[PDB]
Design a protein around this nucleic acid. Structure first.
Ligand SMILES: *O[C@H]1CCO[C@@H]1COP(=O)(O)OP(=O)(O)OC[C@H]1O[C@@H](n2cnc3c(N)ncnc32)[C@H](O)[C@@H]1O
Ligand code: NA
Ligand code: NA
Length: 326
DNA sequence: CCGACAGCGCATCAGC
DNA sequence: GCTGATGCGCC
């Protein structure tokens, strides 16, 4: 399917999703609307009625009702009303700033702070994350083409290896799945001297990337997880590159390949792989693969030395990251 | 009828 | 000072 099919419907549910998350603070309704929007997006027919829709998993009576009103009128009275509501539309908007969630956004709107402009002139009321969110607002909503992503990886792999050539680093996410575009860059990191039963391995890497001016800002940083901002170097006499979000995780060697598997995704793959792994009598999380004893008692973590090792535990042939779409 | 719906690292806040 | 809750972004 393409947008033309049911796009009007999926954008409707998407709008509703966002209002529930950001304004109503109903994360479960947010996820329900998204489930609905997603499954309709894959459905290869121009839907004709709510009842047709209701046959799909995740679409219930309420969405089938909404689809009917939209089909017959071309709009939803609720969305129309919401869209015109200064308070709600402003609360929703502010959440686009990284670090401003629905609670901060409601607080800001409670006190008259409604726009980026109001944020700009109210710097003191923003934490560190939010200020970086604000500063990079437009940059953070841009996608990252694969070629820039390839250039970003070049930099990360070169500099990590310079710090210690025994580091293992893997750019995961959709990029590793061969996506043509990316939302950010997620880098998983491990070192032989770091296992489950075992200095500042992560700080040393972050610092090197800051030394060559690849990492430009820090959103959060501890011993195992770094979240921040990076930027490719502008070619001599040429427009700067956008600033990009990058996350760096330090994982123990023995849970590294579980981490790669998990953070490569995508979600559908993990959910199905975990599902099938349950049928086959193991449990897989982000960190481990544990077998289930006769009743339901998960034993200790199994030895994993590669992504394939975990496939080779649950009788699956190693699927490539290219086809871990579902 | 009613609860699950993922849960974790980190920054910052509420409260002692 | 400290500890725990809360908010946030994230497959
Ligand atoms: O989220 C709903 C689905 C599961 O439980 C709730 C409530 O269901 P209902 O009591 O059957 O319906 P309702 O509370 O009226 O609808 C909830 C949302 O939809 C809007 N809405 C208000 N009134 C209606 C009616 N009569 N029909 C459809 N939708 C309606 C509300 O603004 C709510 O957000
Ligand atoms: Na359904
Ligand atoms: Na945000």
């Amino acid at each position: 399917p393409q947008e033309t099919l049911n796009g009007g419907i999926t954008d409707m549910l998407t709008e509703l999703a966002n209002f529930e998350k950001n304004v109503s603070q109903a994360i479960h309704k947010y996820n329900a609307y998204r489930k609905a929007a997603s499954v309709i997006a894959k459905y290869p027919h121009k839907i004709k009625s709510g009842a047709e829709a209701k046959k799909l998993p995740g679409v219930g009576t309420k969405i089938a009702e909404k689809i009917d009103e939209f089909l017959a009128t071309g709009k939803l009275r609720k969305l129309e009303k919401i869209r015109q509501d200064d308070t709600s539309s402003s609360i929703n908007f502010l959440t686009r700033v990284s670090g401003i969630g629905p609670s901060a956004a409601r607080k800001f709107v409670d006190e008259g702070i409604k726009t980026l402009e109001d944020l700009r002139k109210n710097e003191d009321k923003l934490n560190h994350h939010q200020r970086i969110g604000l500063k990079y607002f437009g940059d953070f909503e841009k996608r990252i083409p694969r070629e820039e992503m390839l250039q970003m990886q070049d930099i990360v792999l070169n500099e990590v290896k310079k710090v210690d050539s025994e580091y293992i680093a893997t750019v995961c996410g959709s990029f590793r799945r061969g996506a043509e575009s990316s939302g950010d860059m997620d880098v998983l990191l491990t070192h032989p001297s770091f296992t489950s039963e075992s200095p500042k391995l992560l700080h040393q890497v972050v610092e090197q990337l800051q030394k060559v001016h690849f990492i430009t800002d820090t959103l959060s940083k501890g011993e195992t997880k770094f979240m921040g901002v990076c930027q490719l170097p502008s070619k001599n006499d040429e427009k700067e590159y956008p600033h990009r979000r990058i996350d760096i995780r330090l994982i123990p060697k023995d849970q590294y390949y579980c981490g790669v598997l998990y953070f490569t995704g995508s979600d559908i793959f993990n959910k199905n792989m975990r599902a099938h792994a349950l049928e086959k009598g193991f449990t897989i999380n982000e960190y481990t693969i544990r077998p289930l004893g006769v009743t339901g008692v998960a034993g200790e973590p199994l030895p994993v030395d590669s992504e394939k090792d975990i496939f080779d535990y649950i009788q699956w042939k190693y699927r490539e990251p290219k086809d871990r779409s579902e």
